[PDB]
Design an enzyme around this catalytic site. Sequence first.
Site, PDB file in Angstrom:
ATOM      1  N   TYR B 133     -78.973 102.087   0.768  1.00 41.53           N
ATOM      2  CA  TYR B 133     -78.405 100.787   1.080  1.00 41.53           C
ATOM      3  C   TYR B 133     -76.957 100.958   1.534  1.00 41.53           C
ATOM      4  O   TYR B 133     -76.175 101.681   0.896  1.00 41.53           O
ATOM      5  CB  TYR B 133     -78.476  99.833  -0.118  1.00 41.53           C
ATOM      6  CG  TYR B 133     -77.858  98.484   0.194  1.00 41.53           C
ATOM      7  CD1 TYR B 133     -76.487  98.275   0.061  1.00 41.53           C
ATOM      8  CD2 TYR B 133     -78.639  97.432   0.655  1.00 41.53           C
ATOM      9  CE1 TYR B 133     -75.908  97.045   0.377  1.00 41.53           C
ATOM     10  CE2 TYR B 133     -78.067  96.195   0.969  1.00 41.53           C
ATOM     11  CZ  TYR B 133     -76.704  96.011   0.828  1.00 41.53           C
ATOM     12  OH  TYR B 133     -76.132  94.790   1.133  1.00 41.53           O
ATOM     13  N   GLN B 194     -83.410  91.218  -1.480  1.00 34.00           N
ATOM     14  CA  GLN B 194     -84.660  91.310  -0.740  1.00 34.00           C
ATOM     15  C   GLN B 194     -84.872  92.710  -0.170  1.00 34.00           C
ATOM     16  O   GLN B 194     -86.005  93.189  -0.137  1.00 34.00           O
ATOM     17  CB  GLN B 194     -84.777  90.237   0.354  1.00 34.00           C
ATOM     18  CG  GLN B 194     -83.689  90.290   1.417  1.00 34.00           C
ATOM     19  CD  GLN B 194     -82.480  89.464   1.054  1.00 34.00           C
ATOM     20  OE1 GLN B 194     -82.304  89.065  -0.105  1.00 34.00           O
ATOM     21  NE2 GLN B 194     -81.637  89.183   2.049  1.00 34.00           N
ATOM     22  N   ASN B 217     -73.271  94.609  -3.251  1.00 35.39           N
ATOM     23  CA  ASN B 217     -72.789  93.463  -4.008  1.00 35.39           C
ATOM     24  C   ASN B 217     -73.558  93.277  -5.320  1.00 35.39           C
ATOM     25  O   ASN B 217     -74.422  94.084  -5.659  1.00 35.39           O
ATOM     26  CB  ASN B 217     -72.856  92.196  -3.149  1.00 35.39           C
ATOM     27  CG  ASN B 217     -74.266  91.870  -2.715  1.00 35.39           C
ATOM     28  OD1 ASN B 217     -75.194  91.891  -3.521  1.00 35.39           O
ATOM     29  ND2 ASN B 217     -74.438  91.557  -1.438  1.00 35.39           N
ATOM     30  N   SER B 240     -62.671 102.600  -8.361  1.00 32.37           N
ATOM     31  CA  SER B 240     -62.093 103.936  -8.337  1.00 32.37           C
ATOM     32  C   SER B 240     -61.121 104.195  -9.500  1.00 32.37           C
ATOM     33  O   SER B 240     -60.528 103.264 -10.067  1.00 32.37           O
ATOM     34  CB  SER B 240     -61.376 104.175  -7.016  1.00 32.37           C
ATOM     35  OG  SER B 240     -62.242 103.886  -5.937  1.00 32.37           O
ATOM     36  N   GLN B 262     -55.303 106.007  -4.630  1.00 30.17           N
ATOM     37  CA  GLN B 262     -56.495 105.364  -5.148  1.00 30.17           C
ATOM     38  C   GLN B 262     -56.222 103.926  -5.507  1.00 30.17           C
ATOM     39  O   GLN B 262     -57.124 103.098  -5.423  1.00 30.17           O
ATOM     40  CB  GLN B 262     -57.028 106.106  -6.373  1.00 30.17           C
ATOM     41  CG  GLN B 262     -57.479 107.527  -6.094  1.00 30.17           C
ATOM     42  CD  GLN B 262     -58.778 107.560  -5.334  1.00 30.17           C
ATOM     43  OE1 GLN B 262     -59.583 106.636  -5.428  1.00 30.17           O
ATOM     44  NE2 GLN B 262     -58.993 108.621  -4.570  1.00 30.17           N
ATOM     45  N   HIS B 265     -56.976 100.807  -2.432  1.00 29.51           N
ATOM     46  CA  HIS B 265     -58.202 100.336  -1.793  1.00 29.51           C
ATOM     47  C   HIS B 265     -59.053  99.416  -2.666  1.00 29.51           C
ATOM     48  O   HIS B 265     -60.053  98.863  -2.206  1.00 29.51           O
ATOM     49  CB  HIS B 265     -59.028 101.524  -1.298  1.00 29.51           C
ATOM     50  CG  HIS B 265     -58.551 102.080   0.007  1.00 29.51           C
ATOM     51  ND1 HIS B 265     -59.230 103.065   0.692  1.00 29.51           N
ATOM     52  CD2 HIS B 265     -57.466 101.780   0.760  1.00 29.51           C
ATOM     53  CE1 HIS B 265     -58.582 103.351   1.808  1.00 29.51           C
ATOM     54  NE2 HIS B 265     -57.507 102.583   1.872  1.00 29.51           N
ATOM     55  N   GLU B 330     -62.949 109.599 -12.987  1.00 26.76           N
ATOM     56  CA  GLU B 330     -63.617 109.896 -11.740  1.00 26.76           C
ATOM     57  C   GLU B 330     -62.931 111.054 -11.047  1.00 26.76           C
ATOM     58  O   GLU B 330     -63.576 112.045 -10.698  1.00 26.76           O
ATOM     59  CB  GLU B 330     -63.570 108.670 -10.831  1.00 26.76           C
ATOM     60  CG  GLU B 330     -64.171 108.907  -9.446  1.00 26.76           C
ATOM     61  CD  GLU B 330     -63.936 107.750  -8.490  1.00 26.76           C
ATOM     62  OE1 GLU B 330     -62.866 107.114  -8.572  1.00 26.76           O
ATOM     63  OE2 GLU B 330     -64.813 107.492  -7.644  1.00 26.76           O
ATOM     64  N   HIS B 331     -61.621 110.899 -10.830  1.00 22.83           N
ATOM     65  CA  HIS B 331     -60.801 111.877 -10.113  1.00 22.83           C
ATOM     66  C   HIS B 331     -59.701 112.361 -11.052  1.00 22.83           C
ATOM     67  O   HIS B 331     -58.998 111.562 -11.667  1.00 22.83           O
ATOM     68  CB  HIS B 331     -60.065 111.237  -8.926  1.00 22.83           C
ATOM     69  CG  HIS B 331     -60.934 110.783  -7.803  1.00 22.83           C
ATOM     70  ND1 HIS B 331     -61.232 111.586  -6.725  1.00 22.83           N
ATOM     71  CD2 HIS B 331     -61.467 109.566  -7.523  1.00 22.83           C
ATOM     72  CE1 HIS B 331     -61.965 110.904  -5.857  1.00 22.83           C
ATOM     73  NE2 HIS B 331     -62.122 109.678  -6.320  1.00 22.83           N
TER      74      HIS B 331
END
Lengths: 382, 382
Positions: B133, B194, B217, B240, B262, B265, B330-331
Site C-alpha cells: 500500500y 477497501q 491513514n 519517527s 528527524q 518531517h 528507531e534511529h
Amino acid sequence: TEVKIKRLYTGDADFASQLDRLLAWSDTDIHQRVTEIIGCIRRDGDAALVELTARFDHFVVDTAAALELPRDVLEAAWQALPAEQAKALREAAERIRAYAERQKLDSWDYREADGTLLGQKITPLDRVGLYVPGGKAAYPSSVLMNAVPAKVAGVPELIMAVPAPRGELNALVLAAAYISGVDRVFRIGGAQAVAALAYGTETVPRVDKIVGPGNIYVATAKKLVFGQVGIDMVAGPSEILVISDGRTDPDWIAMDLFSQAEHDEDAQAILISPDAAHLEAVQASIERLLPGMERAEVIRTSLERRGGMILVDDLEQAAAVANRIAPEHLELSVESPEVLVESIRNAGAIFMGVLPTSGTARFSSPLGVYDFQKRSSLIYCS
Amino acid sequence: SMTEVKIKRLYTGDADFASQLDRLLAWSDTDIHQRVTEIIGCIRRDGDAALVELTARFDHFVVDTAAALELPRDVLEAAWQALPAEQAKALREAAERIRAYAERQKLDSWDYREADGTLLGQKITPLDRVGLYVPGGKAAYPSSVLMNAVPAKVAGVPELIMAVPAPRGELNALVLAAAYISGVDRVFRIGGAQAVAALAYGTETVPRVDKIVGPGNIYVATAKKLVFGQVGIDMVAGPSEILVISDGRTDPDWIAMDLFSQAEHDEDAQAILISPDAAHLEAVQASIERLLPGMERAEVIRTSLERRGGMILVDDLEQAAAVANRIAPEHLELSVESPEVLVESIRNAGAIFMGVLPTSGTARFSSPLGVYDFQKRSSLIY
C-alpha cells in the site's frame, strides 16, 4: 461404529467453496475482564499479582517473592524422573538445540565503494517470558520447543510462568525447564501472568517477548500487550494434511490422522489421495482402530467436525490443494517425496517418508531461534 | 524569550527518573472501527462492484469497470522515462543500495544428517503474493515503494501487487517510476480500507495476497489490524524517532541539526539527546534556539521538540548506553570519539549511525523490514 468424515471431490463444481467451508475457523466479557486484570497489575504490581494468584489458582503466598520456584527444585525434579523419560527429554532437547544452532542469525558487515561500512548487528532479546499451563495437562515438548531456541539465541534471562493450582506441580514440566536452561520460574498464570511479564512488577522482571499458548485469558492478554512486548502467533487447533499415493498401509494413514486429531476436538485432519479405494480403506481402518484408542471420543469429535478426505485426479492436484490448504503439518506418504516436495510451497513442517496453523503457513514460519534474535542496521560513514 | 524552546529535561539522578522517562516515551476511532468493518464486509460480499463504488465515493476516481482500476505497465515505464535525469539517477541509486543489502540478508534453504541418519532441513520459499500500500497524491515518497518492493523481489515474490489511490485521478510520477524499476507486477488505483480488504480476500479483479505492507491513514491501519490472520502485515508505524548520544567533542550546531533532521518531517516525531556533559547540553540548547528560526520547517521542528523532545543528563557513557537501551530508539546516532567501542554496549535500536525501522520501543523485540519478511521457512524431516 461409523465415523462420518466429510468427503470432497475436486471434480465437483462447488468444490472450492466446500474446501473453504471445511477450512473455515472462528467474549466481550472476557475482553473486559482481561483489560481490568492488566490494569490492576500495572497499577498495583505485586500485591495484585499475589491476590489474583490466590483467586484464580488457589495458590496462597505471603509475599510475591514466594511465588518463585527455587532452582534447586528444578534440578531435583529433573533428577527424580524415570530414566527413560530423562533420556527422551535430553535427546529431544539436543535435537532442538542442534537445529536452532543451524538457524541462528549472525552479525556481519561490508564496505560500499565509497568506503561506507554497512552492517547487520544481531542481538538476543534481553528477556523472554514463556507461559505454560498448570497441572498435568501441560506437555514438556512445548517447554523444550520454546525455551531451547531462546537459549540458543543467547537470551540472557528466560523466565517461565506456570501456575500451580492448589500448589500442584508438574515434574516433567519443571525438569524440561531445567534442562532447557530456563533461568527463573514463577508460579503464576492467566492474564495476570501475562501482564506481570509484559510490564514487570517489583518481583517479576519485565520481558521483551512472551511465548507459549494458554487459555482464553492468556491469548486475549497477549493480544492486548502486543506492542509493549512481541508475542508468538496465536495458535489455532492443530492440523495435519496427509498426501497418500495409496501404497501406504491404511492402518498407518489412520494413525497419522489420529496423531493430530487426538489432542483437540477442533483439530483438523485431512487426507488427500488420487486413489478412491485407498480412501475407503482408510475409512475402514479408522472405524476399526478407533475404539481401541484412549482418546477415541476426541478423535471422533475432530474427524466428524473438521475431518476430510479429498479425492484428487493425481499428485499434482494434491500439491495444488495442499498449497491452498497451507497446513500446519504436511505428510508426504508417497514413493518419491523428494520429488513431490518440489511442488510444495505452503506448509509449516513437512514429513517425508510452535508451527503456523489456520492457513498462516502462507506467510509465517515456525517459531525458531530467529524469533528470539533481532537485527539492527549499522552504518559507519567512515 | 521569544526564541526559547521548552525542551523536556531529565536527569538520571532524579528519584522519579524511571517514570519521567516512561512519560517522555509514551505516545498513544470506534466509529472508524465500525466503518472499516462494514467496508471489509462489503468487499467480501460484493467484490468488484463494491470496490468500484467505494473508490468512486472515497477517492472521487470513477471508472466503468473494475478492470479500469489498474494502471497499464506502459504507464509505469513512461513515468520512469519522463523523469528528470537526476531524479532517475537518485531513484536507481537508492534502489541499488537497497537491493545489495537485501541480497546479503536473504534466507537460504539447507539440510543436514543427524548421527542416526535422519534428515533435517529448512526449506525457504518466497511469499506467493504480496500487497504493497502506498498513499495517494503528492504526499507519497518513492522510498516507501523501494524499501518494500525491492526486498520483496529479491526474496523472489512472484506477484507484487501495489495499491495506490488516485484522488480525482491524480498520480505521483516518482511513485510510478519507483514501482517500475523495483519490479512491481501490477498496480491498482484503490486505497483505504477497501484496498486492504480487496488485497486480503481478493476480488475478481484484485488477486488475493498473503501479506500486506506499507503505512497509510487510520483506515488503512485499522483494516490491516482487522485482516491480520487472513494475511501477514508489517509492524504499525510509528512517528519517527532519533536518539543522539554525544560525548561533547562534537560541534553543538551539528548536534542541533541532527535532532532537526528527524524532528522536521513530523510534528509527532521524537528527538532525544543524551550526554554526560551538562555544559554540552546547554550548548546544544543554545545552538537549537539560534539555528531554529533559519529552518524552513521551523514550526514543525519546534512543535516536535516541545511535545516529545528531550535532553537527558547521565553520569557517563555506560549510563548513556543503558538509557538508550531502555529507550530502544528507531534511529540511534553515536556522536562520540570511539563509537566502535560504545556500540558494544548498545542492544536495542533499529539502526545505528557511527561517524523501515521499528519505532515506539519495539526495537526491543523487532527487526527492520527486510528481505526475510517476504520469505518464510518450512521445516523438513526425512
